[PDB]
Write a structure and sequence with these properties.
Layout lengths: L2 E7 L7 E7 L4 E8 L5 E3 L24 E11 L5 E13 L2 E14 L1 H5 L5 E4 L16 H5 L7 E5 L6 E5 L12 E4 L8 E9 L5 E9 L6 E3 L1 H8 L6 E3 L4 E5 L7 E5 L2 E5 L5 E4 L6 E4 L1 E3 L6 E3 L1 H4 L3 E5 L5 E5 L2
Parallel strand pairs: 3-8, 4-7, 13-22, 14-21
Antiparallel strand pairs: 1-2, 1-10, 2-3, 2-6, 4-8, 5-6, 6-7, 9-10, 9-23, 11-24, 12-13, 12-17, 14-22, 15-16, 16-20, 17-18, 19-20, 23-24
PDB class: hydrolase
Keywords: Fragment screening, aspartic protease, inhibition, hydrolase
Assembly: monomeric
Length: about 325
């Protein structure tokens, strides 16, 4: 089998992407944030504290003839940005882009943090990291991809995120029309449960390439590119007037600037992020200070190749017995 679904930016800055997902019978369609940095499929629901729901579409398991309470199971998750959610668990039929999994754990939120409430466009998350990170207790549950894998034509999914435009998530096949040149594959460590890999280096604008190993994760659920402070300082030093602002919480730059590109290495191959992809707009309405899309990972503990980087590439998440990651230009 295969599946193919369009993913759409939630706003004009590409702050996140939402993909429609069918849950239950008859189908209830919710727009979920596909997140290769976590491993829980959770949704706003009829069980979510009413004051914490503000415009989201909810899953109502009592209206699904295929929903079953997973008795005794609970979940609770905290994300890198400090957001969180928790609740109980159902199993139900879940379909993405024509690909159907029966018996999928659908984690129903009883509580969500303010950032989730305040984002009316995201109805939940669909985790695509390794199932070892799944938070369901006392019986850990599998991700949608793990459940689907044996049935797929090939044990892979691909992310093709757009810049200020829709893109595509495919399951079970590699669309050879969706990228230019060749896909370069690179080793993955699953030891922390992430799609963790080692970039071979970077360049700033038309500058020379610096060969240096940068360990990080491919994370579709993170907006920005978070890299070591040395690398990030070298980037922003090429933008007149750019500075790190502790009050804003990262590097900002004059909105009048033209940003240089940023290149990252994948083996001997190179992925070029255009300067425009690094512009996250005014820090507040009307301001002439703009927020940067490349930021230091120093406070985080891990480097993160988030959407700013991934949207410059066609990315293969290869879930074979020994997983790998593939990157192509497009």
């Amino acid at each position: 089998s295969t599946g193919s679904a369009t993913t759409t930016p939630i706003d004009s800055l590409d702050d996140a992407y939402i993909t429609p997902v069918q849950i239950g019978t008859p189908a209830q369609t919710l727009n979920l944030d596909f997140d290769t940095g976590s491993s829980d499929l959770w949704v706003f629901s009829s069980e979510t504290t009413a004051s914490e729901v503000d415009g989201q579409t909810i899953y109502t398991p009592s209206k699904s003839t295929t929903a079953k309470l997973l008795s005794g199971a609970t979940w609770s998750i905290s994300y890198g940005d400090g957001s969180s959610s928790s609740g109980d668990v159902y199993t139900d039929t879940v379909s993405v882009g024509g690909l159907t999994v029966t018996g999928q754990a659908v984690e129903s939120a009883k509580k969500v943090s303010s950032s989730f409430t305040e984002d009316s466009t995201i109805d939940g998350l669909l985790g695509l990291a390794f199932s070892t990170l799944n938070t369901v207790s006392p019986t850990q549950q599998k991700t949608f991809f793990d459940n689907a894998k044996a049935s797929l034509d090939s044990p892979v999914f691909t992310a093709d995120l757009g810049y200020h435009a829709p893109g595509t998530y495919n399951f079970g096949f590699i669309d050879t029309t969706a990228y230019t040149g060749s896909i370069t594959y690179t080793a993955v460590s699953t030891k922390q449960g992430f799609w963790e890999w080692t970039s071979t280096g970077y360049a700033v604008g038309s500058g020379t390439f610096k060969s240096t190993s940068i360990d990080g994760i491919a994370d579709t659920g993170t907006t920005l590119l978070y890299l070591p402070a040395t690398v990030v300082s070298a980037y922003w030093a090429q933008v007149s007037g750019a500075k790190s602002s502790s009050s804003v919480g990262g590097y900002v730059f004059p909105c009048s600037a033209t940003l240089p590109s940023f290149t990252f290495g994948v083996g001997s191959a190179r992925i070029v992020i255009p300067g425009d992809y690094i512009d996250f707009g005014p820090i507040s309405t009307g301001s002439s200070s703009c927020f940067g899309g490349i930021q230091s990972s120093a406070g985080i503990g891990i480097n993160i190749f988030g959407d700013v980087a991934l949207k410059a590439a066609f990315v293969v998440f290869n879930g074979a017995t020994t997983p790998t990651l593939g990157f192509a230009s497009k």
